[PDB]
Amino acid sequence: KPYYVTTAIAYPNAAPHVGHAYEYIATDAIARFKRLDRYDVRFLTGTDEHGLKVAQAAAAAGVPTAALARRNSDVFQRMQEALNISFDRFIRTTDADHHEASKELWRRMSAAGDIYLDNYSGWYSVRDERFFVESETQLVDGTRLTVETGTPVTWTEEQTYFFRLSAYTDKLLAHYHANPDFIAPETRRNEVISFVSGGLDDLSISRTSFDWGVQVPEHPDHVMYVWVDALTNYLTGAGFPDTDSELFRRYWPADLHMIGKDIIRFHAVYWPAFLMSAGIELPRRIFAHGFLHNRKMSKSVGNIVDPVALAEALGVDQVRYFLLREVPFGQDGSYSDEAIVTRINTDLANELGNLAQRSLSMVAKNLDGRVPNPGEFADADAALLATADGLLERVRGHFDAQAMHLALEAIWLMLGDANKYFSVQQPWVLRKSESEADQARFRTTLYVTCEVVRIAALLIQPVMPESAGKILDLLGQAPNQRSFAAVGVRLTPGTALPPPTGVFP
Ligand SMILES: CSCC[C@H](N)C(=O)OP(=O)(O)OC[C@H]1O[C@@H](n2cnc3c(N)ncnc32)[C@H](O)[C@@H]1O
Ligand SMILES: [Mg+2]
Ligand SMILES: [Mg+2]
Ligand SMILES: [Mg+2]
Ligand SMILES: [Mg+2]
Ligand SMILES: [Mg+2]
């Protein structure tokens, strides 16, 4: 019953873009899908408020860092609420309890003998917020940039605590091979295994040139590497260091870390090493998703897609749908103003909206707003119902692999079958007929159409909560008839349906 799922927590240095929304909406779907399938869900999201990337942004505006971090964190939380993210905690690394969780992890790591003091010299990217070797850098017209990210970098000489990541090279490979579903998609798993197979170096995990961060226990001259306290948020969200609490007993180890492909090393290499050191159970699964481009990365150079405005321009549930359908989850895809509209027009307004409005209006005008009593199901009726009866298990299967796009595609294939069934059955002809065989068929074909629309509506709840709820409202479904257990219970004939209205204006 317990299920603990998390998102990456965002740098509140600038405003959110669609990519941030992509990850919160995707993770929200999974969360809502589990709640509807009788799971006890915990859903963590939040912001990563420390580090030099955020401090140098507050210096680029005139405001203290804490204030920039607080204010821009509100903007991230306000954005998530606007997109209807059902998170159970919005964590912020400035929270006092997170300060204590981070300090305990350090203790257990130092007590295991995996932390040692030494001099560090190397090339640090503030944007990426990670260290680079001279080799993974290139000099371009007198500017020092990263070979992969092309990011600026600053030379740094400091005495810092290191982590014996070198001590965990082989345990990690062994864990990777005994836990095949630990990293997904498979392409990314192969990439982590290759990196670790080449050997790991020890990792600087503290800083002395600035104090914006969590205070290293018994060493105020140091603050933790921002990624060390950032990864800890997944423990903080479960009640650590109170490992005897109800929260930590049932929710840790986390079932699923949702992240983007650029931060996999921190989650699949560093994070499990830190937990083996501190004697803590590892997460069960990390799924790294792709990046959303615009026609072109999303650079503050003038190419940002604002998710709140995107939602105001087209609706919350329309954006959530397009993001989880347009892009095979796990691959890289791109946004375009034209692709979102055509997608919405063909998939929501027509393929699903018409089928629901056309069927719900015949019930209003010809059957006195009551679900009709169906007769015997012909071979066309039962085979359509069969398709819709077997969806829950196909869709569940897809959600378990993080393929929401294939879950949606499956729902729409049935809807296509439903429209094509609506056309071969021509129920608008039978309504007029005074014969009794035509009427019963009219009553039967209309029930079948409403019934499969009700199943779709239920299965759509995780992606389009509001619209699905609207459709179920128009189908006379009560508030306790909206779990996945209701999928297998047939629409009750004769229920009073309210007068139909547009779901996708
Ligand atoms: C303990 S976790 C700390 C994480 C760290 N604080 C951090 O990396 O912060 P972040 O704000 O820059 O990125 C936050 C998340 O959004 C993703 N992301 C970023 N741009 C994206 C895009 N264009 N498309 C899809 N996903 C994207 C990105 O891959 C990441 O998973
Ligand atoms: Mg963008
Ligand atoms: Mg397609
Ligand atoms: Mg997707
Ligand atoms: Mg299938
Ligand atoms: Mg009749």
Author numbering: 2 to 296, 299 to 508
Text of the article:
Methionyl-tRNA synthetase (MetRS) is a member of subclass Ia. MetRS is unique among the essential AARSs because it not only charges methionine to tRNA for elongation of translation, but also charges initiator tRNA to initialize translation. MetRS is considered to be one of the most promising drug targets in combatting bacterial pathogens, including MTB. The catalytic domain of MtMetRS spanning residues 1–115 (the N-terminal segment) and residues 226–292 (the C-terminal segment) has a typical α/β Rossmann fold.
We pre-incubated methionine, ATP and Mg2+ with the MtMetRS protein prior to crystallization trials, which allowed the synthesis of an intermediate product in the first step of tRNA charging: methionyl-adenylate (Met-AMP). As expected, we captured a catalytic component complex with Met-AMP fully occupying the active site, providing atomic insight into the recognition of Met-AMP by MtMetRS. The crystals of the MtMetRS–Met-AMP complex diffracted X-rays to 2.4 Å resolution and belonged to space group R3, with a single copy of the enzyme in the asymmetric unit. Our structure reveals that the active site is located on top of the α1 helix and the C-terminal end of the β-strand plane, and is surrounded by helices α2, α3, α7 and α9. The active site can be divided into a binding pocket for methionine and a binding pocket for AMP. While methionine and the ribose and adenosine base parts of Met-AMP are deeply buried, the α-phosphate connecting the adenosine and methionine moieties is more exposed to solvent. The aromatic side chain of Phe292 stabilizes the adenosine base via π–π stacking. In sharp contrast, we found that F-state MtMetRS is characterized by a completely collapsed methionine pocket, a nonexistent AP and a severely reduced groove for adenosine. The binding of Met-AMP induced a conformational change in the nucleotide-binding loop and the active site of MtMetRS was restored to a normal P-state conformation that has no significant differences from the P-state conformation observed in other MetRS homologues. The structure of the MtMetRS–Met-AMP complex demonstrates that the ligand and the CP domain can stabilize the catalytic core and effectively restore the active conformation of the catalytic domain. In the P-state structure, the α2 helix (which is disordered in the apo structure) has a much higher B factor (64.8 Å2) than the average B factor of the entire chain (41.1 Å2), which is unusual for a secondary-structural element.
